[PDB]
Amino acid sequence: GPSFPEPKVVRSQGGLLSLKLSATPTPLAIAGQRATLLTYGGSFPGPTLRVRPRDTVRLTLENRLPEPTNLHWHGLPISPKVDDPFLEIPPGESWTYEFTVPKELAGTFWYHPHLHGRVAPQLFAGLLGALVVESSLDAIPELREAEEHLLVLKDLALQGGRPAPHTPMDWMNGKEGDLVLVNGALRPTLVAQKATLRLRLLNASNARYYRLALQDHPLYLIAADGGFLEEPLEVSELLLAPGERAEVLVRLRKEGRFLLQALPYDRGAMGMMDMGGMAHAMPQGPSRPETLLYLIAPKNPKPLPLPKALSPFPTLPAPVVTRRLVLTEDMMAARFFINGQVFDHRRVDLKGQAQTVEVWEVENQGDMDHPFHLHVHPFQVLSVGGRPFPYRAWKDVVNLKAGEVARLLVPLREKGRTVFHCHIVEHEDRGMMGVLEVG
Ligand SMILES: [Cu+2]
Ligand SMILES: [Cu+2]
Numbered sequence: 001g002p003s004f005p006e007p008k009v010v011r012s013q014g015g016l017l018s019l020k021l022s023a024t025p026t027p028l029a030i031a032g033q034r035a036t037l038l039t040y041g042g043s044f045p046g047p048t049l050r051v052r053p054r055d056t057v058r059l060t061l062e063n064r065l066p067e068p069t070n071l072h073w074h075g076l077p078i079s080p081k082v083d084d085p086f087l088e089i090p091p092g093e094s095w096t097y098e099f100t101v102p103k104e105l106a107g108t109f110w111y112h113p114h115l116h117g118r119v120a121p122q123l124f125a126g127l128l129g130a131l132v133v134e135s136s137l138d139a140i141p142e143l144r145e146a147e148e149h150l151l152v153l154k155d156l157a158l159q160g161g162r163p164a165p166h167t168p169m170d171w172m173n174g175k176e177g178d179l180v181l182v183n184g185a186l187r188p189t190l191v192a193q194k195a196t197l198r199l200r201l202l203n204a205s206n207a208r209y210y211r212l213a214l215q216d217h218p219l220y221l222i223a224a225d226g227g228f229l230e231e232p233l234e235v236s237e238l239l240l241a242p243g244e245r246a247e248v249l250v251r252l253r254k255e256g257r258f259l260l261q262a263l264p265y266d267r268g269a270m271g272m273m274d275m276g277g278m279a280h281a282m283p284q285g286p287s288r289p290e291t292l293l294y295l296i297a298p299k300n301p302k303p304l305p306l307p308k309a310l311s312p313f314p315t316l317p318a319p320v321v322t323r324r325l326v327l328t329e330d331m332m333a334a335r336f337f338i339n340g341q342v343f344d345h346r347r348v349d350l351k352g353q354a355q356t357v358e359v360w361e362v363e364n365q366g367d368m369d370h371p372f373h374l375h376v377h378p379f380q381v382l383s384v385g386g387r388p389f390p391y392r393a394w395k396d397v398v399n400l401k402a403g404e405v406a407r408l409l410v411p412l413r414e415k416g417r418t419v420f421h422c423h424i425v426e427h428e429d430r431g432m433m434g435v436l437e438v439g
């Protein structure tokens with residue numbers, strides 16, 4: 001096959017993407033070993049769905065797992081009556097998701113299970129895939145002529161040819177695996193044919209963070225989770241928390257091999273130690289550095305000029321309310337709270353009004369990083385930890401280090417009941433989720 005593995009793409013046809021996926025245990029070859037994973041479409045990752053604004057999506061999910069499941073269309077601003085976090089598809093049953101892609105939308109999104117209490121093992125076992133919304137901006141020459149690749153970053157651990165089970169410490173920290181894969185492959189080689197690469201990046205891991213850096217090169221950020229920036233932003237490294245997406249341009253500077261690495265990063269994961277009295281909790285400290293892939297630059301590379309503008313960010317109405325959400329932890333219980341409460345699917349936590357703008361102040365009073373996600377309503381990050389954000393773009397996940405406050409601008413779009421939660425999905429399963437009702 002091609003030196004660089006990427007998931008199969010399914011494209012809409014005549015404005016319609018109509019597909020039947022099955023969620024099923026699947027024998028496959030992965031990282032040089034035979035394993036049984038849970039997959040959509042028979043592959044890991046699942047197929048990449050590629051659509052345009054205003055296309056109709058008709059996706060019938062058949063559940064061939066021994067447990068109930070459902071789909072979350074992560075990042076898409078569609079109705080919570082379609083992207084329904086309370087829906088359960090029993091084993092052997094099917095459900096069809098049908099929606100129109102919003103007109104003012106572009107970027108990389110993804111789909112994965114969202115059935116409260118079962119997300120972490122189902123996501124860890126391989127149930128995820130990407131969705132790309134192609135834009136008219138892809139036709140400007142500085143992007144059209146770049147070589148485009150999707151990179152799904154997902155780690156895994158195998159025990160007896162199956163995904164390793166969760167331990168108690170996994171429920172507290174979030175499970176990380178020792179196989180750190182790109183598109184399901186272990187350290188693939190990307191042989192570039194053009195000097196400018198456009199890389200869509202997706203962190204589909206349960207809990208692992210990727211502090212991304214390409215040897216000898218900066219990255220040019222052009223899209224965040226849910227849309228383009230206003231103009232490219234040069235960065236020396238890019239931290240991708242669970243659930244986050246980015247699109248970056250790489251401008252290859254000379255011939256050679258360059259490693260794309262996940263540099264050491266300390267997210268506050270905890271271990272246990274016994275030195276006399278105790279046992280007591282002790283920080284795991286920073287992650288070990290990982291090589292994600294090998295990037296081979298072509299001969300005599302002469303990258304294109306960067307685009308000078310991308311997409312103007314909309315002028316939002318003045319906000320009508322300020323909310324304050326506080327995140328806290330009980331690590332030894334592996335219990336996680338928002339404003340002192342655990343999730344309850346019958347309780348509405350916040351009531352807002354559609355087509356108004358709200359300011360959400362989300363405060364991490366724990367010691368771990370927590371990546372906060374809101375369904376249905378993408379947001380603009382104004383500041384995090386008191387530092388103003390360096391760009392304007394739609395996001396739907398924002399990472400908060402211990403102690404930090406993020407200030408968001410949240411336009412409320414579709415009416416209905418939806419959720420917000422930590423995207424360390426073990427923490428959501430263990431209660432760090434609440435209910436927003438928009439009317
Ligand atoms: Cu998600
Ligand atoms: Cu969390």
Ligand SMILES: [Cu+2]
Pocket residue numbers: 072085114373375419421
């Ligand atoms: Cu969710």
Ligand code: NA
Pocket residue numbers: 022023024026040041042
């Ligand atoms: Na299948």
